Design a protein around this ligand. Sequence first.
Ligand SMILES: OC[C@@H]1[C@@H](O)[C@H](O)[C@@H](O)CN1CCc1ccc(CCNc2cc(Cl)cc(-c3ncon3)c2)cc1
Length: 765
Amino acid sequence: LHSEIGRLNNQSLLWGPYRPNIYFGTRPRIGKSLMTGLMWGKIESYTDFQHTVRYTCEQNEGMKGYGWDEYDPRRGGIQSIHDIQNGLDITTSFVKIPGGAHGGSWAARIKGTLNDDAPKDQKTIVVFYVSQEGENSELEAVPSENEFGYEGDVILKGRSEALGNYKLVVTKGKGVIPQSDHDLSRLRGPGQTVVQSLTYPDEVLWQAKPILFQQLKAGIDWLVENKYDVADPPPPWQVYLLANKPGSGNVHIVQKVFEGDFEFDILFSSESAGKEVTSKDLEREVKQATEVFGERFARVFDLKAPFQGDNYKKFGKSMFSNLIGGIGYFYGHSLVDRSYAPEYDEENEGFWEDAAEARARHQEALEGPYELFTSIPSRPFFPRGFLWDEGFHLLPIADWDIDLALEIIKSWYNLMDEDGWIAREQILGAEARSKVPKEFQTQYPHYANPPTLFLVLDNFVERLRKLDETLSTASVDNPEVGLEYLRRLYPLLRRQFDWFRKTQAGDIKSYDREAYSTKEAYRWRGRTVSHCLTSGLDDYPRPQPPHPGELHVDLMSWVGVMVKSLISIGSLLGATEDVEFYTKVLDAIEHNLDDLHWSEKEGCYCDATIDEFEEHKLVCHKGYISLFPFLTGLLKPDSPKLGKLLALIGDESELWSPYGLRSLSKKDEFYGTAENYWRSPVWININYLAIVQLYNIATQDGPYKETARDLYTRLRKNIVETVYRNWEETGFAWEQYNPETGKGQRTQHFTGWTSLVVKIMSGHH
Ligand SMILES: OC[C@@H]1[C@@H](O)[C@H](O)[C@@H](O)CN1CCc1ccc(CCNc2cc(Cl)cc(-c3ncon3)c2)cc1
């Protein structure tokens, strides 16, 4: 039955618009298969279309905004795109229709409406690009009746082992098709839909833009060769209309030119299902998905006072839909330095220079292929998996669809190597690499990242203890299903725990360090003079200089998170021997957090280092790091330490801004210095952990219940309202928020853990 649910989840989730790196395209969760993508741009001249055409996601002055209005990966959704440069408001509706043996069928409607600014007779070129990878598969465009191109729909027939037989139709669509009266029309037609069918080696089919341009350039070369010149040139849009040549190939370019508003459909029909998908079917299933989305949202994300109003509901739906709509399927090789150079142990003073030297050996090489099914932080700026971000992404997604979240967890843990390492940034294949400078592609097996995916796991466990609808909760509704999933994952969780303790160990015994346990101590590998990227808090101030005797209180707290999860899950699995070990490790971390990291003078936790005189020294920088044992849920509700931490949290002169908790204290000497990434701004992920922990204290008997209740109420409101006001005013989720002005800054489209606001509004943790 676990096996049954697994197959039903696979069939359910196989198709989607799982290419979040582009405005609109589709692919199945299969490495080498059929992929589609949309391009469009206005053409007003002989040289502008190369500058207007849209394909990969960006965000700049020429794009007002874009994102998912509603989305559910089992069903589909609606995206809206507001393009200033191209004078167009675009809607892309995508819907799935279950049936057959190959993961079902799907449809999309592409609709473009000129805005008030655009010339009414604007010419817009639209391309639907279709590629298929694999050795034993076929795809063919059925030729036109007409001489020069298509009057009606374009039908592609194809076949593969993974998809069986299928057909993909691009419908005639609606809108004016310009007509040229030029001489050229005698040879290229007056203006009509055209199809070019081509082949390239499979590994370059993702390069849709260059492939299209090479075809456009050959058309223009033909014009030049055939005496079409500047004394009497065809119109631009006709110069850029490809010569029709359908056929067999692994690339099919379908092009239309429209004057004024337009729409057309894409109908994918899996032969192994019922009759073929129609436009009427598209429209009916779009209506139905929206109805279902609405009902699930109101149930799963019932927003509490004072956020029950329709404005906050719209906001919550946008924030949530952009998060879950960012899910992608990635496939390909990764760049990894597998030298395990000894410089990477970082055992000496000045280790950063030796690690640099080792990196300058450039021993990294491609490996894989790997696949990953994950939500992402940023469509325009970094559309790929990031390890600790995903833990936050899945917190709302798990509310919506626990089976979906488990599927993504499983995907990530399937990357883990024999040692217990998962690379913190997952850049899979040439297409993903195209968004990343080569200097930042290489992954390092000694680089960790926070194990936030355990938080999602903790939520799953608590729900386990206490057809699309069915599937979405199948792993909690059937406890034997959920337990088996845990049974299979548990070893990898355990491997990861051991990997942390083996590779991220700090040094107690080699110095004059007294502590309850001689084992429990941790130091993030990979730090440079000004950064600790592996911690996730890139430039939060750390001991200077970096030092092999450093100890990091956030890392120890994360190990605490892991061991508590392992206790819960071990207990579930009857892993008695494992659990007693975990228990002693927890006890030891609890004491060592105090003995190595607590500052009585400063009234908070601090990272530690080793002096010029070889002595343990605390290095206090009041900010997120200082609160870590509290944030990660390690402290008793009566802890006097917790009480002081609550005082720091609520202190306007330190962390408390009207807009959320500042990452660093205004009193800290590094407040707002250098790049000021984690040295003042308000970050939603850490504010979220604070909110959840304050609520926990607020809803139990204890000495700090009322303090926590007040702080909870206000921080919740502060954080929600800052994200909401910014979204209202800009249309975007931002990476972080300015604590003096409240304004969103750094990158836009960060959905991304900023989307946690939907769960903060939902409340009742
Ligand atoms: O979310 C993942 C991680 C966190 O896990 C970590 O905790 C958190 O601290 C960091 N954060 C983001 C990491 C990240 C930061 C920046 C970049 C882009 C680098 N250069 C660039 C590239 C492009 Cl394509 C556009 C632009 C751009 N920006 C404004 O205008 N143009 C800039 C990539 C990844």
